[PDB]
Amino acid sequence: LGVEGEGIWLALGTIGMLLGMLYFIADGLDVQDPRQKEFYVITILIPAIAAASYLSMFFGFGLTEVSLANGRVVDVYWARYADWLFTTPLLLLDIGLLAGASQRDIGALVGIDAFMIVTGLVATLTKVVVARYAFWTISTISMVFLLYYLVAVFGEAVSDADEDTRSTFNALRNIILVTWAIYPVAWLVGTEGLALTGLYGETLLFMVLDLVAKVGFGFILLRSRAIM
Amino acid sequence: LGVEGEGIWLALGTIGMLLGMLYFIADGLDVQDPRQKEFYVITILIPAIAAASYLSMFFGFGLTEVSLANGRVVDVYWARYADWLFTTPLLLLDIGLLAGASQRDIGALVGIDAFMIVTGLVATLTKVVVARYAFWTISTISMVFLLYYLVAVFGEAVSDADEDTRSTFNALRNIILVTWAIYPVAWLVGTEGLALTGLYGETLLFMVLDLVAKVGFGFILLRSRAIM
Amino acid sequence: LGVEGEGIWLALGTIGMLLGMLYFIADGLDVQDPRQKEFYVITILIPAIAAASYLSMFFGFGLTEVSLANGRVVDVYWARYADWLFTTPLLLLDIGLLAGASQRDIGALVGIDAFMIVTGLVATLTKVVVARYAFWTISTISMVFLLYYLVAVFGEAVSDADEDTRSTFNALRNIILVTWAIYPVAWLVGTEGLALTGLYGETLLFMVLDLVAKVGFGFILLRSRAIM
Numbered sequence A, B, C: 001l002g003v004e005g006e007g008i009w010l011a012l013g014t015i016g017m018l019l020g021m022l023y024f025i026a027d028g029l030d031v032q033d034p035r036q037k038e039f040y041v042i043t044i045l046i047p048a049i050a051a052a053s054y055l056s057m058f059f060g061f062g063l064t065e066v067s068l069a070n071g072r073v074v075d076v077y078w079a080r081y082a083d084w085l086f087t088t089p090l091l092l093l094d095i096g097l098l099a100g101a102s103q104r105d106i107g108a109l110v111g112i113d114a115f116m117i118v119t120g121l122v123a124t125l126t127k128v129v130v131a132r133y134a135f136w137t138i139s140t141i142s143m144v145f146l147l148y149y150l151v152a153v154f155g156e157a158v159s160d161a162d163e164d165t166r167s168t169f170n171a172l173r174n175i176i177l178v179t180w181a182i183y184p185v186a187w188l189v190g191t192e193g194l195a196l197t198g199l200y201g202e203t204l205l206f207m208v209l210d211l212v213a214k215v216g217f218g219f220i221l222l223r224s225r226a227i228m
């Protein structure tokens, strides 16, 4: 149920993540090759983690209240950030391995990703209004950098690969660009920021984004000839 | 000492870990070879972390009350999980390096292990009784998988090694299989779950399990010809 | 602001870290080589993390009160530890990469570093006074070992390198030795320990130490011929 009806999206999110996970598992049963197997392992682990995170939220674990200096009280699902701290580096690993990026480049993006998620958690938890928006601005700046780097650095890495790999990379890159860019906007319009929509709407929006970014992304990756 | 006499097991456990650590250190003083030396470092770090966790719990810092949604109050040593989050992947690294497993395979197992421990911690901290059991179930399923994968995947990797190595692997594998499998049982029968035993018994059980899984395991590993 | 005027050192620390970060970014713009580039990425990420930590503290989010069994109430800037938990391994990685230390050796020091930071956080947060000093002692022991291993192990790794690299390594090593050894002394003399100085003096001291250990260190590294 949740605080303001948002439990329905928490439940549907749990289910959607679980089904993606099982589909991926079903799909990888015959995989023998180590590189290919690796893509399965990372891509199954992603919605496992998101499914468990969603379920914990559905049950109200991982839900806090933050009282701002405003007097405003904000209903903060902080378990999302726990989810994000691990699933976003894994997503970056997934596409970096696809791109054939070096270990040092993947590590650089993982470092900037972690920075983005943690500064976003500070934005979400801080009581001081100006600090909320300062950290949201820090985190978004880091996001813009991360995305530019994904395009330029992973794009360069993938440029000497075969056409199947370049086309799959471009698809996955565009999923990241479009869906990841919406998260900070969603934070800003939802209850953590300007409150233009309430918790129910914000929770719906993240559920859709997460599902696209994990199960949609995973679907496109795992069905590609590029990983075989 | 402690809430209901259980501090004695916290103290013995501290001392035990510390003793195992010191012995391990004393044992590796003349080791020059980097691979052999790596086994020492990992196997010394494990009881260090566990000794420090045990000491924190003995002094009460590793201990919190969790009030359930039915009114039951549960006395929770959450420091265990802090310990487990790091020591279980290090133990898996140890035996994986023994087995000659690939980087990919150790990483996969470590991902599943981390998943297991974190969903365990959720099981332990959540206020809703059905959630407690749901997460204990998710974590136990992950464990069964981890243990299956340890046997099939690390066993396959070690199958091409020399006889001493396979023998030491089999001994260490069986220590993991038997001792790790008892932990979900301990949780279920202890105060976190069905409360068949109290805090004193439950603490004794985890002390014995941890000592076997860390110092017993470490002893068997570091004395083998396989690592020299 | 802050508890007792110490926000001025939080503000100057923020600004100091940010300006170091910016300098380093501006300094790395033309870098083509992957190894040189990696040194820039690490050394930019360090003061970015420290600037975000300092700003969070400046706004009051990286601060909590702790009531000791003493009755004494300590104003704890816990976000320092979050910072240190990531920045001290990255510093070790930086110098390790400079030393040409093996992956094993770097991982071993990062292990012991993490142990040192975590046990220091336990020291800072525990209410039982004897426990606070016991953990401070454990953490300091780990630090002395870490510093020794830095000198012996990383010094041996760098002993076959060219003169510029050896000379840069010795400068950076000496920065670590003097500055890092002072942190436990600040904790001891500051409000967490003997309270010989109040929060304002202690905050000032950590600001100075952090700026030398991150921006001073970074400056010396990134201007060296060794990394080119």
Ligand SMILES: CCCCCCCC/C=C\CCCCCCCC(=O)OC[C@@H](O)CO
Residues within 6 Å of the ligand: A014, A018, A024, A025, A026, A027, A028, A029, A030, A031, A037, A040, A041, A044, A045, A048, A049, A051, A052, A055, B108, B112, B115, B138, B141, B142, B145
């Ligand atoms: C309602 C939340 C449910 C969350 C998931 C619970 C069940 C899963 C529990 C643990 C799994 C964690 C991730 C485990 C990831 C396993 C990946 C694997 O080994 O697959 C190999 C492929 O080739 C197979 O096709």
Ligand SMILES: CCCCCCCC/C=C\CCCCCCCC(=O)OC[C@@H](O)CO
Residues within 6 Å of the ligand: B085, B086, B089, B090, B093, B097, B100, B101, B102, B103, B104, B106, B107, B110, B114
């Ligand atoms: C939620 C955070 C969980 C962190 C778990 C602790 C992480 C640190 C402890 C162990 C990490 C080891 C697993 C990381 C993967 C190590 C694989 C490896 O070392 O391969 C060696 C040779 O086979 C090839 O050169």
Ligand SMILES: CCCCCCCC/C=C\CCCCCCCC(=O)OC[C@@H](O)CO
Residues within 6 Å of the ligand: A038, A041, A042, A045, A049, A052, A053, A056, A062, A079, A082, A083, A086, B103, B104, B107, B108, B110, B111, B112, B114, B115, B118, B119, B122
């Ligand atoms: C309330 C949140 C509940 C969910 C928390 C999730 C905790 C994190 C779980 C899993 C983290 C997995 C980290 C481990 C990820 C391993 C990635 C891997 O397979 O690397 C392969 C390389 O070594 C070789 O190419």
Ligand SMILES: CCCCCCCC/C=C\CCCCCCCC(=O)OC[C@@H](O)CO
Residues within 6 Å of the ligand: A108, A111, A112, A115, A138, A141, A142, A145, C014, C018, C024, C025, C026, C027, C028, C029, C030, C031, C037, C040, C041, C044, C045, C048, C051, C052, C055
């Ligand atoms: C005011 C609080 C502090 C806010 C700092 C926010 C900084 C966010 C921007 C980036 C995140 C830091 C991680 C940045 C790590 C990558 C930097 C890089 O690749 O530089 C290229 C080199 O060649 C140098 O030119």
Ligand SMILES: CCCCCCCC/C=C\CCCCCCCC(=O)OC[C@@H](O)CO
Residues within 6 Å of the ligand: B038, B042, B045, B049, B052, B053, B056, B082, B083, B086, B090, B093, C103, C104, C107, C108, C110, C111, C114, C115, C118, C119, C122
């Ligand atoms: C009270 C709780 C205290 C918890 C403190 C946790 C500190 C330990 C954290 C991480 C330890 C793992 C880091 C060190 C893990 C070993 C690194 C290594 O040897 O890797 C490469 C090789 O495998 C290549 O063959």
Ligand SMILES: CCCCCCCC/C=C\CCCCCCCC(=O)OC[C@@H](O)CO
Residues within 6 Å of the ligand: C085, C086, C089, C090, C093, C102, C103, C106, C107, C110, C114, C118
């Ligand atoms: C509750 C948290 C307890 C502490 C866990 C944190 C442990 C440290 C976490 C992140 C450290 C990242 C810094 C960088 C870690 C570098 C890992 C490494 O061994 O690389 C060596 C190779 O590059 C050599 O060629």
Ligand SMILES: CCCCCCCC/C=C\CCCCCCCC(=O)OC[C@@H](O)CO
Residues within 6 Å of the ligand: C140, C144, C145, C147, C148, C151, C152, C153, C177, C181, C184, C185
């Ligand atoms: C009142 C307490 C004050 C703080 C006490 C602890 C502060 C740290 C003290 C000393 C830090 C450095 C000690 C360890 C660093 C020296 C190790 C060394 O010299 O090795 C040389 C060999 O490798 C040559 O081949």
Ligand SMILES: CCCCCCCC/C=C\CCCCCCCC(=O)OC[C@H](O)CO
Residues within 6 Å of the ligand: A103, A104, A105, A106, A107, A108, A109, A110, A111, A112, A114, A115, A118, A119, A122, C033, C034, C035, C036, C037, C038, C039, C041, C042, C045, C049, C052, C053, C056, C082, C083, C086
């Ligand atoms: C408020 C506190 C916020 C704290 C948030 C901390 C987030 C970052 C932590 C660890 C990232 C470590 C990532 C490892 C960095 C390696 C970078 C690298 O190897 O780059 C090579 C370069 O790209 C090519 O030459």
Ligand SMILES: CCCCCCCC/C=C\CCCCCCCC(=O)OC[C@H](O)CO
Residues within 6 Å of the ligand: B014, B018, B024, B025, B026, B027, B028, B029, B030, B031, B037, B040, B041, B044, B045, B048, B051, B052, B055, C108, C111, C112, C115, C138, C141, C142, C145
């Ligand atoms: C009572 C609580 C005690 C808690 C712990 C007390 C302090 C332990 C010191 C460092 C932590 C462990 C770090 C170990 C790092 C590896 C050390 C090593 O390299 O040992 C080599 C071995 O002898 C083969 O040569």
Ligand SMILES: CCCCCCCC/C=C\CCCCCCCC(=O)OC[C@H](O)CO
Residues within 6 Å of the ligand: B140, B144, B147, B148, B151, B152, B155, B177, B181, B184, B185
């Ligand atoms: C109440 C219950 C609480 C939880 C109890 C959990 C017990 C799990 C222990 C062992 C099963 C998993 C490990 C063994 C499963 C695989 C055995 C096997 O046949 O592996 C053969 C291998 O594939 C040949 O190469």
Ligand SMILES: *C/C=C(C)/C=C/C=C(C)/C=C/C1=C(C)CCCC1(C)C
Residues within 6 Å of the ligand: A084, A087, A088, A091, A116, A117, A119, A120, A121, A123, A135, A136, A139, A140, A143, A180, A181, A183, A184, A187, A210, A213, A214
């Ligand atoms: C599977 C989950 C995904 C891919 C989530 C990605 C999340 C982000 C890109 C988060 C972005 C944020 C900002 C850049 C500003 C601060 C608010 C955040 C954390 C929502």
Ligand SMILES: *C/C=C(C)/C=C/C=C(C)/C=C/C1=C(C)CCCC1(C)C
Residues within 6 Å of the ligand: B084, B087, B088, B091, B116, B117, B119, B120, B121, B123, B135, B136, B139, B140, B143, B180, B181, B183, B184, B187, B210, B213, B214
């Ligand atoms: C050194 C510590 C060791 C080897 C501890 C291992 C711990 C586990 C195998 C924990 C298992 C659990 C379950 C599978 C269900 C949920 C409760 C746990 C975390 C106790």
Ligand SMILES: *C/C=C(C)/C=C/C=C(C)/C=C/C1=C(C)CCCC1(C)C
Residues within 6 Å of the ligand: C084, C087, C088, C091, C116, C117, C119, C120, C121, C123, C135, C136, C139, C140, C143, C180, C181, C183, C184, C187, C210, C213, C214
């Ligand atoms: C950039 C930040 C740096 C380099 C911080 C270093 C911090 C330490 C060396 C910490 C030392 C501590 C002890 C050894 C005893 C416990 C108190 C600590 C955590 C301050």
